[PDB]
Amino acid sequence: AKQDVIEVIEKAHNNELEPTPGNTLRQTFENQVNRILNDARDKTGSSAQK
Amino acid sequence: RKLRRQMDIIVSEVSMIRDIREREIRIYTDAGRICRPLLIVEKQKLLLKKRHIDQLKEREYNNYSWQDLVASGVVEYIDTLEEETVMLAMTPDDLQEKEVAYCSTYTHCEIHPSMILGVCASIIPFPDHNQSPRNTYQSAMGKQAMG
Amino acid sequence: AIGQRIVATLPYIKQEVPIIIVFRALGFVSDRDILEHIIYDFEDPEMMEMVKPSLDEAFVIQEQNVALNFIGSRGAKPGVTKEKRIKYAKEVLQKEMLPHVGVSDFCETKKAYFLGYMVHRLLLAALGRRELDDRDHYGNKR
Amino acid sequence: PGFVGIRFCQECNNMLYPKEDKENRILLYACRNCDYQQEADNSCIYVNKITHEVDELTQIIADVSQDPTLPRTEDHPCQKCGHKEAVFFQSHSARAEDAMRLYYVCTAPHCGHRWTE
Amino acid sequence: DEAHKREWNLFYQKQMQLRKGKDPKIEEFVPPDENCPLKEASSRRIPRLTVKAREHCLRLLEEALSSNRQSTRTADEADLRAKAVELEHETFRNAKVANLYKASVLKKVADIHRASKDG
Amino acid sequence: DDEEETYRLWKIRKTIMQLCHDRGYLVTQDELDQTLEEFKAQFGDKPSEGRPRRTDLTVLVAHNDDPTDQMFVFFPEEPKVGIKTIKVYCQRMQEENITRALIVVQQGMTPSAKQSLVDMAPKYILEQFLQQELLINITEHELVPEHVVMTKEEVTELLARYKLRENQLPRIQAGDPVARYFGIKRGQVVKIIRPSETAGRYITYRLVQ
Amino acid sequence: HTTLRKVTANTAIYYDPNPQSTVVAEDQEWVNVYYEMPDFDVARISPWLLRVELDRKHMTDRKLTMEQIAEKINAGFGDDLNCIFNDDNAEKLVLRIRIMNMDDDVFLRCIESNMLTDMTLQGIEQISKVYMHLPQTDNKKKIIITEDGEFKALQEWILETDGVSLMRVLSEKDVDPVRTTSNDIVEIFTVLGIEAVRKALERELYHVISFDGSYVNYRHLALLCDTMTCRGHLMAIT
Amino acid sequence: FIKDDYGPESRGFVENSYLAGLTPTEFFFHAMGGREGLIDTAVKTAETGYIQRRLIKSMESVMVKYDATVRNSINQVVQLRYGEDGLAGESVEFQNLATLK
Amino acid sequence: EDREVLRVIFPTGDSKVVLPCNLLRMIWNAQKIFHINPRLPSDLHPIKVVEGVKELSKKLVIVNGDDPLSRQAQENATLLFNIHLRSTLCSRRMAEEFRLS
DNA sequence: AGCGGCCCTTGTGTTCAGGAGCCAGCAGGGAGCTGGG
RNA sequence: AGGGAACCCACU
DNA sequence: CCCAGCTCCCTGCTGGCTCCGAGTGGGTTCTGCCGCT
Ligand SMILES: [Zn+2]
Ligand SMILES: [Zn+2]
């Protein structure tokens, strides 16, 4: 998940990131980062519960 | 900074902030600025050396005190505004060279990170293992405890 | 109206004063001098455009005594005499405005420079070249 | 076109305003407290850049290469002098929505070359 | 604010009046010559539009159609005049303001020019 | 500016036909379901060119109970309606003996015109509508339950059954959109029928005040 | 809502004494192409030019054309102004404005300020933004009954706005006037009446209460809504 | 941290469990998060209390009458039958309608 | 007809409703109390179900009175419950699903 | 021994819960009317 | 036969 | 037989007023005094 966030950051830093409809670019970057980290939290939680 | 670290003309209490992006240097001698001491890092090394620890171990006899650390320019007081311009290492392990250096331009190091806590929160054991509202609750209850 | 005017609210003056009027009351009449105190790089047209409404708002008042009378009239209890109004306005500008810059006579240049710096900071905020200040930042507290 | 600055009267050093030569159909910059006058050359008395396509590189100053809190990179050498180290940062200026773009400054003293990628 | 817009309208009308002559010097509409090939040449639908302007626009349409024909080698000639007159009449029927009418005619001219370029 | 105006006039006419039918007047099923093409056919297609003129759209309907009860619907051409045009309409209503009329305005009506409308109330009942209000039928919105005007006998039966005075019923304002749609005045009672998730159905009554 | 300012890249006021020769080469070429025959009165022309450049990107996004903008300018200002514009195929979208004969330059400034913000090209005032999405929960899907007699949920596009103009939006073509609603109850009361607002108040309160998955028996909500609407107007709980 | 660090650690992603223990920066960010909840409690209380009082005062005299109508103290009819079905809320249950679907 | 009415009341397909008497649990209780063997034919005449439900419906009164207003108000007040009762206590369901004596 | 007078320091002078929402009163404008030309 | 106000800390 | 006041009514703005969770346990200081009548 950390490496994925790094990839998203590196993409935004090269202007290769395009906003989703109804969102500025920064909101799009924050959405993607929060999605990655939420998925990581859910996956680790499931592993612990198992 | 050299003068302040020598304690020549600028007392330790004085804050000097350079805003590089702006072109302002701000110097404050007011009363009421909250500050904290930090270890000075030059290049990538603590200015605090083994000899300072040796001299402090014998502070009972030789009288070498905290004030001598400040006088020898090994520790500094940093207020919040100056902290805005500091590059701070959490521990000296951050100054060790690494495959991909994060910073490599540290100016200061923490003495010990547990110093972020006040008097009541300092009696909690393993506070870094509790949910934070629980540390807050102990911080009050400890003032209600009989001794 | 068309643009954005800059107005200073002085202590003991119950109405806002156009900023250029304050600068003139300090003894700077030429627009060039006032802008030299406010804008440090004349190669910055954007800042120049941002100050014109303030120059226009105070265009009739072109003399120090006229501006001083303006401020004194704006005072809390204006004196019918114009001489006493000017005296009161001068006392305010010398003693109640920016005391930390100086409260003695022959301090109009320092006061003008600090007021120009304040206007410059406001312009930088309005142009989005400098972030607004955080009231809860503990460096801004004592 | 770009922004159109302001002019000051040569005599009273007050701001010059635009006036036209009714008889000659020529643009004049004429003082309004004195009686000085001048002949314009731009002919564009006003500009309003809605899109605000302003160059952030012009605002960067080379001094930021001395900031110890900025990240440093060794993968974008500067063209002007080929030095291998630079600091990089974002714009952080209002009127910057896609403001995640990086800007680079060469850390070699007395070069101070700013660029973008 | 919708009242503020009304205030702007009043001020703008006042300034127009200041810039408007006391009496509207109505230049009498020029009646088209009987040789006018413009349909509805006697219409006054579009205000401040002269029949001579329509004739000039139709001449431009004629030139555009001639260019299209010579590029594509169109056979008939009578169609050229009829097509130009029809285009002008359509433009007059659609538009309702002089400048928009002229812009539409110029757009049609550009379209015909591009089609001729295409072949 | 012409197709749009034609569509607007067609919508207003359809809503007015629905309103007249709901108030009990006689309207044929073809008028209710008149398509936009049929509107362009019967009436003009160039309101800018005066075909149709708003004066061409006037309608006159008669009640189902007595043909003597009739209603006009007028469409003044002038976006703002003043006293003079109201007097004109009142004059022709008096001439033809028509006591009710709907006036569909574009921008509004002058305050004095409204005062006139209320002044001659008991003799002639003529009501005002913005055309924006008539571009849709609000009684067809899902939030609007079925409203039914009660007769005096029904109101008497209701108050006797529940042993209520009129002032104990819930209220509806005479300026309510639905009340204006049905043209009900102070002192009348409207019966409201709505579905309920607990009972299935529930009837409530509102007195016009 | 779309004002002119949302489709303009920049504006500028020049001093063009004779339109025949202009300060911009491309402008001069296209204008003289426009100035073939005297379609105007040279005397009633001011030397002050107002030049406006539009964004191709925004103009296309809203499917706007300089013809529509010119028509809007004509409607809002009339013939007293003289708007002309180049062809869309051109490299840049431009349109020139003059005034037919306060100073004319300051007057042009005032006109440009008003024209950028007050002149409306598209949309409804007070509706500042509109979102468009396909619902994933059935509470906004279109629920039908098939000819076999079963409930079926159809995905369809719905729009959410930032402001409210319920009466105007309801009258727009292609807008469903049966289901289109508002979350602003005073607007509902104004447009649809007291029984409508009674229903809408219940729905809004239910939304708030049940957002957590919590549940309150219907009779309590109904009693509150009846208390608030029984006197024919909205009675605030204050 | 360095300037313009948008990574997980810099912006407050705690990658440790409570059993492992938080690092100093994680500890501080977690303290910021927890403070938010304490504040929410200490302010929401007064807002909600005022709302509750207004609700009660607005409906305090509404009651079921012996004719089974719901009326206020002025004797105005608020509902012709309580809840539109005339039932008390304690003895109803969730059930399914078998002929709807 | 009840089904069409329900389709109007719940235009979504949500069959979950809040009603007084849990009919399914009552039927299960009856099956247990009277030792109903589901695997045998029953002695319950299907006409007895129809008439029994009609009488019961007459006995469940929220709005009393014989005038037309009272009768319609009573019909409305118990409409949903009566639809539920008729679609649960059907002769078909009683014969082939619940099998009550 | 007890009434007067309040001390608000700038007789002139910093925030007496600050902020969030309704009611009253005023200015401003426009419709309509009417006595002179 | 018995006071009161103000302010501060704290508890659920 | 039009026009300029004149009146009357409706809007829009600004200023002013009321309100701000429920209980409970401790503590402390303060409820006047001085000039001369
Ligand atoms: Zn000059
Ligand atoms: Zn370099």
mmCIF file of all heavy atoms in Angstrom, chain C residues 10-38:
data_model
loop_
_atom_site.group_PDB
_atom_site.id
_atom_site.type_symbol
_atom_site.label_atom_id
_atom_site.label_comp_id
_atom_site.label_asym_id
_atom_site.label_seq_id
_atom_site.Cartn_x
_atom_site.Cartn_y
_atom_site.Cartn_z
ATOM 1 N N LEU C 10 -8.187 53.310 11.899
ATOM 2 C CA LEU C 10 -7.257 53.809 12.889
ATOM 3 C C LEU C 10 -7.867 53.741 14.277
ATOM 4 O O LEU C 10 -9.090 53.694 14.430
ATOM 5 C CB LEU C 10 -6.872 55.255 12.569
ATOM 6 C CG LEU C 10 -5.878 55.470 11.430
ATOM 7 C CD1 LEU C 10 -4.515 54.964 11.829
ATOM 8 C CD2 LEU C 10 -6.339 54.796 10.159
ATOM 9 N N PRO C 11 -7.044 53.719 15.319
ATOM 10 C CA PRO C 11 -7.587 53.848 16.673
ATOM 11 C C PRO C 11 -8.018 55.280 16.940
ATOM 12 O O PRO C 11 -7.300 56.230 16.626
ATOM 13 C CB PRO C 11 -6.418 53.429 17.567
ATOM 14 C CG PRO C 11 -5.207 53.703 16.757
ATOM 15 C CD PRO C 11 -5.583 53.535 15.320
ATOM 16 N N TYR C 12 -9.209 55.427 17.520
ATOM 17 C CA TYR C 12 -9.827 56.729 17.764
ATOM 18 C C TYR C 12 -10.278 57.399 16.471
ATOM 19 O O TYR C 12 -10.247 58.624 16.358
ATOM 20 C CB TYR C 12 -8.891 57.661 18.532
ATOM 21 C CG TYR C 12 -8.356 57.069 19.808
ATOM 22 C CD1 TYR C 12 -7.048 57.285 20.196
ATOM 23 C CD2 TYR C 12 -9.163 56.298 20.630
ATOM 24 C CE1 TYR C 12 -6.554 56.749 21.361
ATOM 25 C CE2 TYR C 12 -8.678 55.757 21.800
ATOM 26 C CZ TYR C 12 -7.372 55.987 22.160
ATOM 27 O OH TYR C 12 -6.878 55.450 23.327
ATOM 28 N N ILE C 13 -10.691 56.608 15.486
ATOM 29 C CA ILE C 13 -11.277 57.115 14.252
ATOM 30 C C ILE C 13 -12.410 56.164 13.900
ATOM 31 O O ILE C 13 -12.161 55.030 13.479
ATOM 32 C CB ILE C 13 -10.268 57.197 13.101
ATOM 33 C CG1 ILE C 13 -9.027 57.987 13.519
ATOM 34 C CG2 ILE C 13 -10.912 57.821 11.886
ATOM 35 C CD1 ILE C 13 -9.264 59.456 13.694
ATOM 36 N N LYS C 14 -13.646 56.618 14.060
ATOM 37 C CA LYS C 14 -14.800 55.735 13.992
ATOM 38 C C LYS C 14 -15.257 55.446 12.570
ATOM 39 O O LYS C 14 -16.318 54.843 12.389
ATOM 40 C CB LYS C 14 -15.956 56.331 14.796
ATOM 41 C CG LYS C 14 -15.568 56.735 16.211
ATOM 42 C CD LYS C 14 -14.909 55.586 16.963
ATOM 43 C CE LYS C 14 -14.722 55.908 18.438
ATOM 44 N NZ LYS C 14 -13.299 56.185 18.778
ATOM 45 N N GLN C 15 -14.494 55.854 11.563
ATOM 46 C CA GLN C 15 -14.759 55.467 10.188
ATOM 47 C C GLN C 15 -13.451 55.101 9.508
ATOM 48 O O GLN C 15 -12.394 55.646 9.832
ATOM 49 C CB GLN C 15 -15.450 56.582 9.405
ATOM 50 C CG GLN C 15 -16.961 56.555 9.506
ATOM 51 C CD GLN C 15 -17.574 57.926 9.336
ATOM 52 O OE1 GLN C 15 -17.291 58.847 10.103
ATOM 53 N NE2 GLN C 15 -18.411 58.076 8.319
ATOM 54 N N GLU C 16 -13.527 54.171 8.564
ATOM 55 C CA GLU C 16 -12.328 53.765 7.855
ATOM 56 C C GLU C 16 -11.831 54.896 6.968
ATOM 57 O O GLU C 16 -12.609 55.671 6.410
ATOM 58 C CB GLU C 16 -12.581 52.512 7.018
ATOM 59 C CG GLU C 16 -13.515 52.690 5.836
ATOM 60 C CD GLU C 16 -14.931 52.274 6.150
ATOM 61 O OE1 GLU C 16 -15.305 52.288 7.342
ATOM 62 O OE2 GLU C 16 -15.665 51.922 5.206
ATOM 63 N N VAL C 17 -10.512 54.981 6.841
ATOM 64 C CA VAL C 17 -9.846 56.016 6.067
ATOM 65 C C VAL C 17 -9.226 55.349 4.849
ATOM 66 O O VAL C 17 -8.562 54.322 4.995
ATOM 67 C CB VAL C 17 -8.762 56.742 6.884
ATOM 68 C CG1 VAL C 17 -8.166 57.876 6.084
ATOM 69 C CG2 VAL C 17 -9.339 57.241 8.190
ATOM 70 N N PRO C 18 -9.417 55.871 3.643
ATOM 71 C CA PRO C 18 -8.654 55.352 2.506
ATOM 72 C C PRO C 18 -7.163 55.412 2.791
ATOM 73 O O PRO C 18 -6.664 56.364 3.390
ATOM 74 C CB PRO C 18 -9.053 56.281 1.359
ATOM 75 C CG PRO C 18 -10.396 56.783 1.728
ATOM 76 C CD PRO C 18 -10.529 56.736 3.217
ATOM 77 N N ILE C 19 -6.451 54.368 2.369
ATOM 78 C CA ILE C 19 -5.070 54.193 2.805
ATOM 79 C C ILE C 19 -4.185 55.313 2.271
ATOM 80 O O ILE C 19 -3.295 55.813 2.974
ATOM 81 C CB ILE C 19 -4.560 52.797 2.395
ATOM 82 C CG1 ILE C 19 -3.357 52.397 3.247
ATOM 83 C CG2 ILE C 19 -4.204 52.747 0.922
ATOM 84 C CD1 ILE C 19 -3.675 52.164 4.690
ATOM 85 N N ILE C 20 -4.412 55.733 1.027
ATOM 86 C CA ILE C 20 -3.577 56.785 0.457
ATOM 87 C C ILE C 20 -3.744 58.079 1.233
ATOM 88 O O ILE C 20 -2.801 58.869 1.348
ATOM 89 C CB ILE C 20 -3.896 56.978 -1.034
ATOM 90 C CG1 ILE C 20 -3.724 55.663 -1.793
ATOM 91 C CG2 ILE C 20 -2.998 58.041 -1.621
ATOM 92 C CD1 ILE C 20 -2.299 55.169 -1.862
ATOM 93 N N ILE C 21 -4.935 58.326 1.775
ATOM 94 C CA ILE C 21 -5.125 59.507 2.609
ATOM 95 C C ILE C 21 -4.227 59.437 3.832
ATOM 96 O O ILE C 21 -3.646 60.444 4.248
ATOM 97 C CB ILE C 21 -6.602 59.656 3.008
ATOM 98 C CG1 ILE C 21 -7.429 60.062 1.796
ATOM 99 C CG2 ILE C 21 -6.746 60.680 4.112
ATOM 100 C CD1 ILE C 21 -8.907 59.908 1.997
ATOM 101 N N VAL C 22 -4.111 58.256 4.439
ATOM 102 C CA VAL C 22 -3.227 58.109 5.589
ATOM 103 C C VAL C 22 -1.790 58.379 5.179
ATOM 104 O O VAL C 22 -1.046 59.080 5.877
ATOM 105 C CB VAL C 22 -3.381 56.710 6.213
ATOM 106 C CG1 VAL C 22 -2.662 56.649 7.543
ATOM 107 C CG2 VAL C 22 -4.841 56.366 6.392
ATOM 108 N N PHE C 23 -1.378 57.840 4.035
ATOM 109 C CA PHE C 23 -0.007 58.063 3.591
ATOM 110 C C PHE C 23 0.267 59.543 3.366
ATOM 111 O O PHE C 23 1.341 60.042 3.717
ATOM 112 C CB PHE C 23 0.271 57.266 2.324
ATOM 113 C CG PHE C 23 0.856 55.920 2.585
ATOM 114 C CD1 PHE C 23 0.046 54.810 2.697
ATOM 115 C CD2 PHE C 23 2.216 55.764 2.729
ATOM 116 C CE1 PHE C 23 0.582 53.575 2.942
ATOM 117 C CE2 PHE C 23 2.755 54.531 2.973
ATOM 118 C CZ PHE C 23 1.938 53.435 3.078
ATOM 119 N N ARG C 24 -0.686 60.260 2.771
ATOM 120 C CA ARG C 24 -0.506 61.695 2.571
ATOM 121 C C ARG C 24 -0.476 62.440 3.897
ATOM 122 O O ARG C 24 0.367 63.320 4.098
ATOM 123 C CB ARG C 24 -1.605 62.240 1.666
ATOM 124 C CG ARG C 24 -1.186 62.252 0.218
ATOM 125 C CD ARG C 24 -2.347 62.388 -0.724
ATOM 126 N NE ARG C 24 -1.946 62.049 -2.082
ATOM 127 C CZ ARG C 24 -2.760 61.558 -3.004
ATOM 128 N NH1 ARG C 24 -4.049 61.388 -2.770
ATOM 129 N NH2 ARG C 24 -2.268 61.229 -4.193
ATOM 130 N N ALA C 25 -1.369 62.091 4.820
ATOM 131 C CA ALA C 25 -1.330 62.702 6.140
ATOM 132 C C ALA C 25 0.014 62.474 6.810
ATOM 133 O O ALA C 25 0.423 63.265 7.663
ATOM 134 C CB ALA C 25 -2.455 62.145 7.008
ATOM 135 N N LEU C 26 0.711 61.402 6.448
ATOM 136 C CA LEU C 26 2.060 61.201 6.955
ATOM 137 C C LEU C 26 3.090 62.079 6.256
ATOM 138 O O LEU C 26 4.220 62.181 6.743
ATOM 139 C CB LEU C 26 2.465 59.733 6.815
ATOM 140 C CG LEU C 26 1.899 58.795 7.880
ATOM 141 C CD1 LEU C 26 2.152 57.355 7.501
ATOM 142 C CD2 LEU C 26 2.495 59.099 9.234
ATOM 143 N N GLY C 27 2.737 62.707 5.139
ATOM 144 C CA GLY C 27 3.640 63.620 4.469
ATOM 145 C C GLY C 27 4.247 63.060 3.203
ATOM 146 O O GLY C 27 5.401 63.353 2.876
ATOM 147 N N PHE C 28 3.481 62.250 2.480
ATOM 148 C CA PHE C 28 3.907 61.678 1.204
ATOM 149 C C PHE C 28 2.787 61.950 0.208
ATOM 150 O O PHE C 28 1.739 61.302 0.255
ATOM 151 C CB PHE C 28 4.194 60.186 1.330
ATOM 152 C CG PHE C 28 5.369 59.871 2.198
ATOM 153 C CD1 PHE C 28 5.222 59.740 3.562
ATOM 154 C CD2 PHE C 28 6.622 59.714 1.649
ATOM 155 C CE1 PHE C 28 6.300 59.457 4.361
ATOM 156 C CE2 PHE C 28 7.704 59.429 2.446
ATOM 157 C CZ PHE C 28 7.542 59.301 3.804
ATOM 158 N N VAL C 29 3.011 62.903 -0.691
ATOM 159 C CA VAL C 29 1.945 63.368 -1.572
ATOM 160 C C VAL C 29 2.044 62.740 -2.954
ATOM 161 O O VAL C 29 1.039 62.293 -3.510
ATOM 162 C CB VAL C 29 1.970 64.906 -1.642
ATOM 163 C CG1 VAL C 29 1.873 65.492 -0.245
ATOM 164 C CG2 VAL C 29 3.226 65.402 -2.343
ATOM 165 N N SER C 30 3.239 62.690 -3.526
ATOM 166 C CA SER C 30 3.410 62.119 -4.851
ATOM 167 C C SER C 30 2.988 60.657 -4.853
ATOM 168 O O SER C 30 3.377 59.889 -3.969
ATOM 169 C CB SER C 30 4.866 62.248 -5.284
ATOM 170 O OG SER C 30 5.062 61.721 -6.579
ATOM 171 N N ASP C 31 2.195 60.267 -5.850
ATOM 172 C CA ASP C 31 1.829 58.862 -5.976
ATOM 173 C C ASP C 31 3.063 57.985 -6.097
ATOM 174 O O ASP C 31 3.079 56.857 -5.590
ATOM 175 C CB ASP C 31 0.922 58.657 -7.185
ATOM 176 C CG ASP C 31 -0.467 59.209 -6.968
ATOM 177 O OD1 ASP C 31 -0.696 59.853 -5.924
ATOM 178 O OD2 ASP C 31 -1.330 59.003 -7.843
ATOM 179 N N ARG C 32 4.106 58.488 -6.751
ATOM 180 C CA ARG C 32 5.324 57.706 -6.899
ATOM 181 C C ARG C 32 5.915 57.354 -5.542
ATOM 182 O O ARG C 32 6.331 56.214 -5.318
ATOM 183 C CB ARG C 32 6.332 58.479 -7.743
ATOM 184 C CG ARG C 32 7.602 57.723 -8.037
ATOM 185 C CD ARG C 32 7.356 56.615 -9.025
ATOM 186 N NE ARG C 32 8.533 56.341 -9.837
ATOM 187 C CZ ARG C 32 9.023 57.171 -10.746
ATOM 188 N NH1 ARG C 32 8.470 58.349 -10.977
ATOM 189 N NH2 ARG C 32 10.097 56.809 -11.441
ATOM 190 N N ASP C 33 5.952 58.313 -4.617
ATOM 191 C CA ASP C 33 6.533 58.042 -3.306
ATOM 192 C C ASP C 33 5.711 57.021 -2.532
ATOM 193 O O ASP C 33 6.261 56.082 -1.941
ATOM 194 C CB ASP C 33 6.646 59.337 -2.511
ATOM 195 C CG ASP C 33 7.615 60.311 -3.130
ATOM 196 O OD1 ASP C 33 8.536 59.860 -3.842
ATOM 197 O OD2 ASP C 33 7.457 61.528 -2.906
ATOM 198 N N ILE C 34 4.391 57.186 -2.526
ATOM 199 C CA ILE C 34 3.541 56.256 -1.798
ATOM 200 C C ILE C 34 3.721 54.847 -2.345
ATOM 201 O O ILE C 34 3.908 53.886 -1.590
ATOM 202 C CB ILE C 34 2.074 56.711 -1.870
ATOM 203 C CG1 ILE C 34 1.951 58.150 -1.371
ATOM 204 C CG2 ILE C 34 1.200 55.797 -1.046
ATOM 205 C CD1 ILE C 34 0.534 58.655 -1.286
ATOM 206 N N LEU C 35 3.693 54.704 -3.669
ATOM 207 C CA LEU C 35 3.842 53.372 -4.235
ATOM 208 C C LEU C 35 5.240 52.821 -4.013
ATOM 209 O O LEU C 35 5.411 51.604 -3.913
ATOM 210 C CB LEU C 35 3.507 53.388 -5.720
ATOM 211 C CG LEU C 35 2.074 53.786 -6.062
ATOM 212 C CD1 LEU C 35 1.787 53.442 -7.502
ATOM 213 C CD2 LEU C 35 1.072 53.120 -5.143
ATOM 214 N N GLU C 36 6.250 53.684 -3.935
ATOM 215 C CA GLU C 36 7.582 53.204 -3.600
ATOM 216 C C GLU C 36 7.610 52.642 -2.191
ATOM 217 O O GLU C 36 8.372 51.719 -1.893
ATOM 218 C CB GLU C 36 8.600 54.330 -3.750
ATOM 219 C CG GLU C 36 9.186 54.426 -5.139
ATOM 220 C CD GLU C 36 10.171 55.561 -5.280
ATOM 221 O OE1 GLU C 36 10.225 56.419 -4.375
ATOM 222 O OE2 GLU C 36 10.893 55.598 -6.296
ATOM 223 N N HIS C 37 6.793 53.202 -1.304
ATOM 224 C CA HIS C 37 6.685 52.647 0.039
ATOM 225 C C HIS C 37 5.848 51.374 0.074
ATOM 226 O O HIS C 37 6.037 50.543 0.964
ATOM 227 C CB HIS C 37 6.096 53.685 0.987
ATOM 228 C CG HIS C 37 7.074 54.737 1.396
ATOM 229 N ND1 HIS C 37 7.725 55.537 0.484
ATOM 230 C CD2 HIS C 37 7.523 55.111 2.615
ATOM 231 C CE1 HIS C 37 8.531 56.363 1.125
ATOM 232 N NE2 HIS C 37 8.426 56.126 2.418
ATOM 233 N N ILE C 38 4.927 51.201 -0.869
ATOM 234 C CA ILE C 38 4.059 50.027 -0.863
ATOM 235 C C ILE C 38 4.586 48.925 -1.773
ATOM 236 O O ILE C 38 4.589 47.754 -1.395
ATOM 237 C CB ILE C 38 2.630 50.432 -1.255
ATOM 238 C CG1 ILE C 38 2.020 51.303 -0.164
ATOM 239 C CG2 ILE C 38 1.783 49.199 -1.487
ATOM 240 C CD1 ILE C 38 0.760 51.988 -0.579
#
